[PDB]
Every structure is written in structure tokens, then in C-alpha cells.
Nucleic acid binder design. Structure first.
Lengths: 71, 91, 123
RNA sequence: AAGGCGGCCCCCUGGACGAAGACUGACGCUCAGGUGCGAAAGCGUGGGGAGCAAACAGGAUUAGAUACCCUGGUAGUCCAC
RNA sequence: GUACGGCCGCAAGGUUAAAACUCAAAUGAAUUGACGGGGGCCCGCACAAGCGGUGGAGCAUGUGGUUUAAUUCGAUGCAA
RNA sequence: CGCGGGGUGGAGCAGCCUGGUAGCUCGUCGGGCUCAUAACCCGAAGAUCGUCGGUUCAAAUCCGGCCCCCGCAACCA
């Protein structure tokens, strides 16, 4: 099925944590742990610690999000 | 005269690594050289708001005893930012 | 090896260490939901997996999976947990029993319903 | 026996092996626990100190170089217990 | 070979010796490659030995770039 | 009137009691290394040695003033 309570809000890469991990601060309100989307990692697309990025956030855990749009 | 020697402070150079080579940078200044800090960001023309001016500023602020800095530059040229550091000037 | 040696020190089978000690050899246990959250899994997987921390009637406090698509669980939810690890979630060694106590069934399931606490739809 | 033992001479001393025959008459093998031995570094006291050299200082190399290289150099390396 | 307990040591430490937790591996030898600041042996106008060139100049020509309403599309390291 | 240490090149030093063309570092501008950059290497530019009077063969270094920076010292409520 796949519910639809997902979101695409944007933000900026803050920290450059380990294993394709980032502090990404949502333009919206705060920042989340944000991990690099599979797609994106498969197509490489390095991601500097200060880029505007798109996030996929499950209301289930706003605290986390996946980076969708590369830059 | 006063020479130019140099130190660097890259990102990921914090207290550990850092103030060890703040000791190295005293040494430069304390020879009576003008010790030039070079930042070398993982970054850009505006790399940081973090990388540089934690480090640089705390290098000044810790070394402030012996050395002071010419400028707190915060104009990066390239992917790297020189903060220039000198002997503290006798008025 | 020697007979003499075994006669002094008998063969001694190793005692199996359990994978669900919090259950204390019970088929399920009851417990209150302490935290209800999501967490990301291990290489090579990637998701936001629903888990909860649960204080059990016997004092143990453990993390437990909340399987299925969608759930209406929060703190102070009283749930039933069963054995069953989540492999790409280290630390997670129990599953929540959908459709028992405060835990609702999965919405709109048609296949494998009984593993998700879903009544048979009138039809 | 293992650790390990190397200039030459003497003194004290352990083990191994060969030849021949006499003697004892299974006195043998192994060994938990026990006991003894056990490189180098290290420790304590007092000696000793040429060379070498942790530490440490200085010179270089390097983006950095708390290293590798160089100039020095303390413990230690030597003796007794 | 960690913690706790015991014994030992001036100390550094030694000796005996667990459990929770976590993973579906860890490991041995050999095999085919690839790689080595890796090495050995050996070939090719690869070097060496030679003769004549290209790089300079003017023009031909292709490309890039720049320009343009358009300068049509493709070929891009040796192998455009 | 009130202590410390300094003034040399764009910046910071060495050359000091041991008075005879002021050299050593970072920057500056070039050159070299690289496919290229960083880094590194060869190099050149760059000075009334604060400013004066004394003093001397010739005083960077020699004394004292003018003056400036820093040092703590102080504005110590």
C-alpha cells in the first residue's frame, strides 16, 4: 500500500557525520539526522556539509529524514 | 627581521590535535616570526560558519598572551582562509 | 582425552544462553510503552522502523518491534510482546503482538491477517 | 631441561657418549597440587660508565612530522647482592 | 586473558578466571586473477643508433571556444 | 610625574654587553615540479636599524632625550 503522510520539505546540510550521514537543518524548523537516499548513493553524488537538500520525512519520526533531491 | 612562517588549522583539528599545534604556533611567533595561520577548509569561498572561526578565533584567544593577530580576516580566498598572526605589537 | 582425565573431569555440556531472556520462558509478556519512536537499520538496509521501549510486568525494560504498515501506539499504551528479533535492528529482540490489548490490528490487511491482528472482513 | 652459553689460562662442578666385563634385582614411566630454574626490559641499595641509546634538547624533512635522517644525550646497557 | 574475589609483587604488574551484551560469521591451507614504490626472464621503431619531420611562419582542414536567428546532429585520453 | 620589555623590509625576527656594506622566516612578484591545483623546490624584489643630540677610524649594535607599541601595572567599585 504505502501510506502518504510522507513529506518533501527542504533544508541545508549542517554536519558531515559518518557513513553518508548529515545534520541537515530543515529550512522549515529544525534539523534531522538525514541519511543519504539509496538512489542518490547508487548514483554517487557526493554531498558537501553545506547544501540545500530535499528531505523525505515520515510523521512517524520527524526526527529523521532521507535526502531525496541532490542539491 | 620578522619572518613569515606558517601553521595550518584544518577542520577536525580540535583541542586534542589543535592546542598541541597551538604550542607549535607559539613556537613560531616566539622565535619572533609572524606566524601565518592558513585555514584549509573542506569547503569553498564560504565554506563555513564553523570551521574557520572557531579555530582561528580560539587560536587568537588562546595565544593572545604572546601573539596577536593582525586581522580576524573572515574573507576566504578560495577554499582556504588566511588569518594572519603576528607578534603582539608594543605600542 | 584420557579416560583417567574424564574420570577426574566429566564431559560438561554448555548451557544454552537464551535470545529472549526478558520473556523468562513465557510465550508473551505484558508491559507499558515507555517510548514510541522510529530508528534506522543496519547495512545494507535503510528505513524508518517503528519500535517502542516497553517496561514489562517483570521489571525488564526492552525494545520491541511494531510490525505492519501503520500503528496507533503511544506512551502508556499497554501492549503484549512476543519473542522474535529484528535482524537489521541490533538490540531489537522482541515483536509486539498486533491486535492485542491496546495495540490495534493492521488496517486493511487481507493476506496473513492473523499475524497482524486483523478480523476477517465481512464479504 | 628450557632460558640460553664463544678470546686465552687455572681452580670448583653438572650432564652426555663409547668399550669391556662385574654388581644390585623391576629399584620403572608419568605427574594434579608443591618446589626450583627462567631472554630482554623494568624495580631497590651501592659501585661502574668507553661505545650504544628509551626520555629529552637542538638541526632538518613535511601540508603537518610529537617520527623515519643528522648533532647531542639521561635512565639503561656493565659489577655485587 | 578483561572484571570481581584470592594468592604473589616496593612498583610495573603476574597468576587463577567469569558474565551481560553483540554478530553469522571469525579462521586454516590451497586455486584463478588483479595489484606491488615488488621482483625475475622476454618481446614490439619502446629506448638506443640514424635520416627526415611536427612545435615558429603563411595558407588548407577538423575540433574547442566565442559569436549568431541559425551557425544542424554525432565522434572527445592512447582508441575524438 | 609610575613599573616591564621592545622600535630593521609589507608583518614578525636575528644580527646584543662580543661597534666595520642588515640577513633570517611568513607574505609580495616570478621561475621550477604536476595532465592540472594544493603542497613543495630554485629565485629576485623589499631598509635614515624609531627619531636626535652625543661620540668615533667606522657605532646596527655605542649613551641620553623626543616619541611610539605592547607588558602588567590602572579606570583598583
Amino acid at each position: 500500500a504505502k501510506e502518504k503522510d510522507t513529506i518533501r520539505t527542504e533544508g541545508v546540510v549542517t554536519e558531515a557525520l559518518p557513513n553518508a550521514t548529515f545534520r541537515v537543518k530543515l529550512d522549515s524548523g529544525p534539523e534531522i539526522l538525514a541519511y543519504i537516499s539509496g538512489k542518490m548513493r547508487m548514483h554517487y553524488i557526493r554531498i558537501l556539509p553545506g547544501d540545500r537538500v530535499v528531505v523525505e520525512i515520515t510523521p512517524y519520526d520527524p526526527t529523521r529524514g532521507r535526502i531525496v533531491y541532490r542539491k | 627581521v620578522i619572518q613569515v612562517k606558517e601553521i595550518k588549522f584544518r577542520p577536525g583539528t580540535d583541542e586534542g590535535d589543535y592546542q598541541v599545534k597551538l604550542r607549535s604556533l607559539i613556537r613560531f611567533l616566539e622565535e619572533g616570526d609572524k606566524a601565518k595561520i592558513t585555514l584549509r577548509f573542506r569547503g569553498r569561498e564560504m565554506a563555513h560558519q564553523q570551521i574557520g572561526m572557531e579555530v582561528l578565533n580560539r587560536v587568537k584567544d588562546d595565544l593572545q598572551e604572546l601573539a596577536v593577530v593582525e586581522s580576524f580576516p573572515t574573507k576566504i580566498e578560495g577554499r582556504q582562509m588566511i588569518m594572519v598572526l603576528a607578534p603582539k605589537k608594543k605600542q | 582425552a584420557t579416560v583417567n582425565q574424564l574420570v577426574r573431569k566429566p564431559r560438561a555440556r554448555k548451557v544454552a544462553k537464551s535470545n529472549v531472556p526478558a520473556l523468562e520462558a513465557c510465550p508473551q509478556k505484558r508491559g507499558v510503552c515507555t517510548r514510541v519512536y522510529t530508528t534506522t537499520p543496519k547495512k545494507p538496509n535503510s528505513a524508518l522502523r517503528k519500535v517502542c521501549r516497553v517496561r514489562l510486568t517483570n521489571g525488564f525494560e526492552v525494545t520491541s518491534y511494531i510490525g505492519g504498515e501503520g500503528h496507533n501506539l503511544q506512551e502508556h499504551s499497554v501492549i503484549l510482546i512476543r519473542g522474535g528479533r529484528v535482524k537489521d535492528l541490533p538490540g531489537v529482540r522482541y515483536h509486539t503482538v498486533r491486535g492485542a490489548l491496546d495495540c490495534s490490528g493492521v488496517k486493511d490487511r487481507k493476506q496473513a491477517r492473523s499475524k497482524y491482528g486483523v478480523k476477517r472482513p465481512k464479504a
